[PDB]
Amino acid sequence: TLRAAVFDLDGVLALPAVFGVLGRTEEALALPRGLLNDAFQKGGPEGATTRLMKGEITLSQWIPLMEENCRKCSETAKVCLPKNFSIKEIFDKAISARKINRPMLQAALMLRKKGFTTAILTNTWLDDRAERDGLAQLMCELKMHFDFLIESCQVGMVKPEPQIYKFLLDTLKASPSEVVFLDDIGANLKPARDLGMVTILVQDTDTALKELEKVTGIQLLNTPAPLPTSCNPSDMSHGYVTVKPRVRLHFVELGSGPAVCLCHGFPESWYSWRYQIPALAQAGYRVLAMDMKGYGESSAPPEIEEYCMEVLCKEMVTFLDKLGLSQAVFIGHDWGGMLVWYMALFYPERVRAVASLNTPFIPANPNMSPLESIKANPVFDYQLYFQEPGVAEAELEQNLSRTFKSLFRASDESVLSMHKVCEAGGLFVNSPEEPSLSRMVTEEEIQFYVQQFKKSGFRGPLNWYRNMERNWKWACKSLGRKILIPALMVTAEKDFVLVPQMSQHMEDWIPHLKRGHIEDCGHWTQMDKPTEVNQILIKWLDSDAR
Amino acid sequence: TLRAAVFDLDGVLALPAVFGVLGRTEEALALPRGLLNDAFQKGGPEGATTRLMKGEITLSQWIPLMEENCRKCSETAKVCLPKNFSIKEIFDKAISARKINRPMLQAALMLRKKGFTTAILTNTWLDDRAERDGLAQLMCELKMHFDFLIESCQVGMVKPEPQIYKFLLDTLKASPSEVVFLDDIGANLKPARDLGMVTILVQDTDTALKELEKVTGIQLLNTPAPLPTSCNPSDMSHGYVTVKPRVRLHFVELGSGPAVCLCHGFPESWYSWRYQIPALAQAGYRVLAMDMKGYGESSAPPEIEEYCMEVLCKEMVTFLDKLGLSQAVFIGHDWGGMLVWYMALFYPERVRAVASLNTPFIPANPNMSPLESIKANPVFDYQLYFQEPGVAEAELEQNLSRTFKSLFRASDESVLSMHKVCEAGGLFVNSPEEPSLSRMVTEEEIQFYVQQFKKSGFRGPLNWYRNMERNWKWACKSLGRKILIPALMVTAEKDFVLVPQMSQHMEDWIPHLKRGHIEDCGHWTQMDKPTEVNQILIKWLDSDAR
Ligand SMILES: O=C(O)Cn1cc(Br)c(C2CC2)n1
Ligand SMILES: O=C(O)Cn1cc(Br)c(C2CC2)n1
Ligand SMILES: [Mg+2]
Ligand SMILES: [Mg+2]
């Protein structure tokens, strides 16, 4: 029956309520109880506040009216306002004090997730103060999680006027009985109730959520910790840079602040960072999540040498040039991890800081052919399997769904051993035709990859592995250097190929290296442990790249 | 005969030379003359400096070696280094002191422009100091103006070694006699001379330029002030954001720093900002230059109401949302100018600051139909001509080259009077079939527009003018507000439609409005007076949006 949930901003989705700083200021300043609310409300439907909430005047135009109102109320109550009494001041402080009320957001999220239409309906103002960006950030962070945002100052109406609930219903395309509406002010609930909506009077969040859980029959309280926000590909800004005649690179771009360039591994996609993109943008960074050469909407030339680290790096430098970026932070995973280390070593002036997930920095051994280094570790056998052009292409391209469903698995779910892959004749010789879905991925997500890999297949991706000798030789040039810019190595306990201990000597080459470590996490780090990854990158970004 | 010009960075394209801070420090500190150069050069082809210039070690690895060298030299010369003597310090200061030597750059530019291949060949280092971004910015700013940049620490060779000149020649695809090479160190010139290249020993810039002028037979000295850097469209980052199902917006994106959204007028293009894009990126801003709805690579739905200011504004807000931008500075021209004022008035929380070129802010007159306001001013007659769907489309689309060549003209070149356009039956009824090129535009540039307008024609663009009543009504809602965020109005003396005096009352609505004014400039402001526009926007950005 109930099919839509409507939340207010002040006192419901965001706390402490700004209305409530009137009360607190009165106490703090020993003013007559209610004096400030009286001034805030003076003239009712015709006073300054209502004009403000209706969008007739801006906040800065309103501030002096409220001032005058406060003086009127203090005269009539035969008291004085303190020296330095400042409405601008009180409101600047209250508006920045207000934060998202996380449990209310997650309940709205869960309801949206079980099929509800969700809306914010709020009495709010046109904000033109010096410090307005603060409110603009909050609204941006909230509005994305809801179907609609209805703001009194944009529609020219205000709660409790009946017309705005009529507008609400009309916006929702629902009848009154299908809607639950939550508000911290009872007077605002009343016209929703008149129409026969379920209403919830929000005092403490937990009680309100109990009421909401009861009435919708969905669990909202005591729910497991949810995944971070993901990315819907068709809501992203898609960017395209031609770095040379036959090579253009695609990336997705979110946020502002220092530039953070995300570099995925084999055989993945920008979308491999879908959990980190909003989190890092939210944390104050300009995230550029690439399709690396060979992938997705980037160019995929056929020749092997187009994919040697030297050419790949120079292309990433050009990509910075053409975007007008003097540096970026480079964060990589798997092959992307390898590339960012080399960016640190050959272009430190372009790298604000470097981090790798799973991929350790190992210097070339000048006395040992790289092919032999690889034959030393049985778990790298899959890399020899990738050498002969066509062989791996045929297996990986035969059945795309099957490929990604077999590869993208958590530590406890794996179906393919990297063990004697050449000998067995292939990577999937002993895995199902129809693999079960890993807990890490949905069917929709697997299909995104499938669709990406239909444009170019696996020749470009595989070529990344086909320049061992060439990379070795270019790497030998850097054996005298150290990496001395800010640097983070994140090891993944259950990555049975890029094992943690493979990173154990890195400090000899990177003396001030910082570490994070993630337990119970396999090779597909970002999707396996997205919360831990986000926490480790943001903490490291905030302290080292800023 | 001469077909290529090769410039060094230190002492030639950039001044003061860092080599020269060794000399100055010696004097400042009363050290033995040459003591620091001796330490810098110690061990010659096998000392630390050469290893550095070859890319064997990074700058920060080198710093302690130079330190040790300085101590060695002071011992042997039986002197003391002062307390607090610091190579890190001396080099941090010298490297930031160094700036582009503008007259050398403009000569390289002019030579490139007359057909030369141009290169930078420099002995330089891998820079990993905390303050490396400074050097990275310089190199970015220089490297874009040349065909090649050859850096000793990337190719593993150094001037004066013969092999690097061989590499140079090979990179240029020219023989030695076709090349002029300039350097401030004679020893570096010598192997170029051995090969039969023209060399110039650069001491003062002006004398070097005289030599270069003589030997190439091109004027380099005393040349008129050149246009600002323009944009080559296929070197830009192209961005695409879907703001709703049938509407995607395209923009070009350059630089980092605060977000600056450029909004063009009718009937133009992102490319209408080609002169401002590099200048504003260079000044430390993240420039997003749009194709506005209706244009270029943005969507162009046919319905008139898709182009009313309300819908246009809401779409620009969504565009910020999807890019994760809480605000941007909005700068508009002509119709774009109108749109940014309305962004200021309905979304001040999203606008860091607002500026308009030519378009004044005029409030709706609540007592006068907007069609009548327009019939009041004979110079707006062209706007009535634009009302009837199809009529203007047919004339403007008949011959695209002719259209843009007729419209894009400087104040003294105009062929079309906005005077009684309806009566004459059209905007071009009394202009040539083949108009001459305006001084403001090349044939190539006109063709870019032509090509842009072949995708959607003029229906979308013209629809911007077809919502007078609808815009009037939405504008009436804002008649109580003022614009109180940072705001700049730039008037164009010879814009005979958007005349300066049309802005004369703006201060009543925008009390702290700032102004710039440009003389001898018609309607096509950005291309007419690109230097003045750049100077006025950057000065206003730096003081009001930062
Ligand atoms: O290591 C694992 O957990 C599973 N795995 C599958 C592949 Br392909 C790899 C290579 C590191 C890229 N690892
Ligand atoms: O005013 C001028 O200088 C020439 N001109 C041509 C046109 Br269409 C216009 C309208 C302001 C857009 N002006
Ligand atoms: Mg409330
Ligand atoms: Mg020099």
Residue A415 CA, chain-centre distance (Å), reads 30
Give the closest residue to B518 by CA, choosing from B486, B544, B495, B542.
B495
DSSP B451-510: HHHHHHTTHHHHHTTS-HHHHHHHHHTTTT----S-EEEEEETT-SSS-GGGGTTGGGT-
Out of B418, B458, B502, mutate this one to test ligand 2's pocket (max ligand atoms within 8 Å of CB): namely: B418
Q: Which helix (H) or strand (E) holds A111?
A: helix A102-113
Select the residue from B133, B135, B141, B256 to test the A interface by mutation, using most A Cβ atoms within 10 A.
B256
Q: If you take atom 7 of ligand 2, which residue's CA is the nearest one?
A: B407
The dihedrals phi and psi of B100, each to the nearest 5 degrees, come to: -60, 135
Q: Give CA–CA dist B3/B111, Å, rounded.
A: 9
Sign (positive/negative) of CA torsion B363, B365, B366, B370? negative
Catalytic position from the list B465, B495, B528, B544: B465
Could you tell me how many helices (H) and strands (E) chain B has, helices first? 24, 15
Joined together, the tokens standing for residue B526 give: 């950005």
Strand partners, A288: A253, A261
DSSP-derived 3-state class of residue B67:
helix
CA distances from B500 to A199, B419, B465, B484, B518 (A): 56, 19, 21, 21, 10
Give the closest residue to B535 by CA, choosing from B265, B253, B280.
B280
Q: Which residue has the tokens 């504004």?
A: B313
Residues 6+ apart with CB under 8 A from B93: B21
Q: Give CA–CA dist B182/B122, Å, rounded.
A: 11
Q: Which of residues 275-294 of A touch B (CB under 8 A)?
A: 278, 281, 286
Which of B137, B286, B352 has the CB atom closest to A326's CB atom?
B137
Contact A471, A370 (CB under 8 A): yes
Sign (positive/negative) of CA torsion B185, B186, B187, B191? positive
Contact A515, A489 (CB under 8 A): yes
Q: Give CA–CA dist A176/A514, Å, rounded.
A: 56
Q: Which residue has the tokens 């003591």?
A: B35
Amino acid at B29: L
CA distances from A444 to A436, A528, B319 (A): 14, 17, 26
The long-range contacts involving A243-248, CB below 8 angstroms and separated by at least 24 positions, are A243/A315, A243/A318, A243/A319, A243/A322, A244/A315, A244/A318, A246/A299, A246/A301, A247/A293, A247/A298, A247/A299, A247/A301, A247/A306, A247/A315, A248/A298, A248/A299
Angle at B510 between CA B504 and CA B512, to 5 degrees: 100
Q: Give CA–CA dist A384/A423, Å, rounded.
A: 11
The answer to whether the annotation marks B8 as part of a ligand binding site is yes
Joined together, the tokens standing for residue A286 give: 């300009």
Give the closest residue to B467 by CA, choosing from B344, B348, B339, B378.
B339
B228 class by beta-carbon count within 10 Å (0-12 exposed, 13-18 middle, 19+ buried): middle
For A402-437, letters b (16+ CB in 10 Å) and e give bbbbbbbbbbeebebebeebeeeebbbeebeeebee
Asked if the C-beta of A235 comes within 8 angstroms of chain B's C-beta atoms, the answer is: yes
B213 class by beta-carbon count within 10 Å (0-12 exposed, 13-18 middle, 19+ buried): middle
Q: Give CA–CA dist B360/A302, Å, rounded.
A: 55
Q: Give CA–CA dist A143/A154, Å, rounded.
A: 15
Joined together, the tokens standing for residue B127 give: 């820079």
Q: Give CA–CA dist B117/A514, Å, rounded.
A: 45
The CATH code belonging to domain B236-546 is 3.40.50.1820
Out of A498, A501, A525, mutate this one to test ligand 1's pocket (max ligand atoms within 8 Å of CB): namely: A498
DSSP B150-199: EEHHHHT--TTSHHHHHHHHHHHT--GGGEEEEES-HHHHHHHHHTT-EE
Contact A399, A369 (CB under 8 A): no
Q: Which residue has the tokens 């607002």?
A: B354
Contact A236, A252 (CB under 8 A): yes
Contacts of B232 in chain A (CB under 8 A): none
Q: How many CB pairs under 8 A join A and B?
A: 155
Cis ω for the linkage preceding B160 (within 30 of 0): yes
Q: Give CA–CA dist A154/A133, Å, rounded.
A: 18
For chain A, the residue count is: 546
Kindly compute the dihedral angle of the four CA atoms of residues B402, B408, B411, B417, in this order, to the nearest 10 degrees.
50
Q: If you take atom 5 of ligand 1, which residue's CA is the nearest one?
A: A523
Sign (positive/negative) of CA torsion A314, A318, A324, A330? negative
B170 is an active site residue: no
Q: Give CA–CA dist B375/B420, Å, rounded.
A: 11
The dihedrals phi and psi of A273, each to the nearest 5 degrees, come to: -100, 10
Structure-determination technique = X-ray
Asked if the C-beta of B58 comes within 8 angstroms of chain A's C-beta atoms, the answer is: yes
DSSP-derived 3-state class of residue A480:
coil
Catalytic position from the list B291, B334, B495, B528: B334
Is the shortest distance between the CB of B48 and ligand 2 below 6 Å?
no
Contacts of B143 in chain A (CB under 8 A): 321
Strand partners, B181: B6, B199
Contact B252, B270 (CB under 8 A): yes
> Are A239 and B242 within 8 A, CB to CB?
no
- Record the resolution, in angstroms: 2.4
Is the shortest distance between the CB of B528 and ligand 2 below 6 Å?
no
Contact B256, B301 (CB under 8 A): no
Strand partners, B516: B490
Q: How many CA atoms lie less than 13 Å away from B379 in the CB half-sphere?
A: 6
Q: Which residue has the tokens 């060439």?
A: A470
Question: What's the maximum distance between 2 C-alpha atoms anywhere in chain B?
Answer: 94
Q: How many CB atoms lie within 10 A of CB B30?
A: 8
The dihedrals phi and psi of B420, each to the nearest 5 degrees, come to: 50, 50
The dihedrals phi and psi of A83, each to the nearest 5 degrees, come to: -70, 135
Q: Give CA–CA dist B419/A237, Å, rounded.
A: 43
Give the closest residue to B239 by CA, choosing from B319, B302, B177, B171.
B319
Instruction: Please list every protein residue whose CB sits less than 6 Å from any atom of ligand 1.
Output: A 334, 382, 407, 495-498, 522-523
Q: Which residue has the tokens 């090979």?
A: B170
Q: Give CA–CA dist B467/B309, Å, rounded.
A: 8
Contacts of B151 in chain A (CB under 8 A): none
Joined together, the tokens standing for residue B514 give: 């700032």
DSSP-derived 3-state class of residue B518:
strand
What is the Rg, in whole angstroms, of the alpha carbon atoms belonging to chain A?
29
What is the Rg, in whole angstroms, of the alpha carbon atoms belonging to chain B?
29
For residue B322, how far is its CA from the centre of ligand 3 (angstroms)? 27
Which class does domain A1-16+97-217 fall in? alpha beta
Cis ω for the linkage preceding B267 (within 30 of 0): yes
Catalytic position from the list B250, B264, B333, B523: B523
Q: Would you list the domain boundaries of chain B?
A: 1-16+97-217, 17-96, 236-546
Q: How many CA atoms lie less than 13 Å away from B201 in the CB half-sphere?
A: 5
Contact A347, A321 (CB under 8 A): no
Contacts of A324 in chain B (CB under 8 A): 140, 254-256, 278, 281
B1-16+97-217 and B17-96 have identical folds: no
DSSP B205-265: HHHHHHHHHHHHTS--SS---PPPP---GGGSEEEEEEEETTEEEEEEEE--SSEEEEE--
For chain B, the residue count is: 546
Closest residue of chain B to A310, computed from CA coordinates: B154
Q: Which residue has the tokens 């703006």?
A: B506
Q: Give CA–CA dist B345/B510, Å, rounded.
A: 11
Out of A359, A379, A462, A495, mutate this one to test ligand 1's pocket (max ligand atoms within 8 Å of CB): namely: A495
Residue A317 CA, chain-centre distance (Å), reads 25
In CATH terms, B17-96 corresponds, of 1.10.150.240, 3.40.50.620, 3.40.50.720, 3.90.550.10, to 1.10.150.240
Residues 6+ apart with CB under 8 A from A234: B242
Strand partners, B463: none
Asked if the C-beta of B232 comes within 8 angstroms of chain A's C-beta atoms, the answer is: no
Asked if the C-beta of A260 comes within 8 angstroms of chain B's C-beta atoms, the answer is: no
Is the shortest distance between the CB of B498 and ligand 2 below 6 Å?
yes
Q: If you take atom 5 of ligand 2, which residue's CA is the nearest one?
A: B523
> Are B126 and A482 within 8 A, CB to CB?
no
| Enzyme catalytic residues of A | 334, 465, 523
Strand pairing class (A259-263; A286-290): parallel
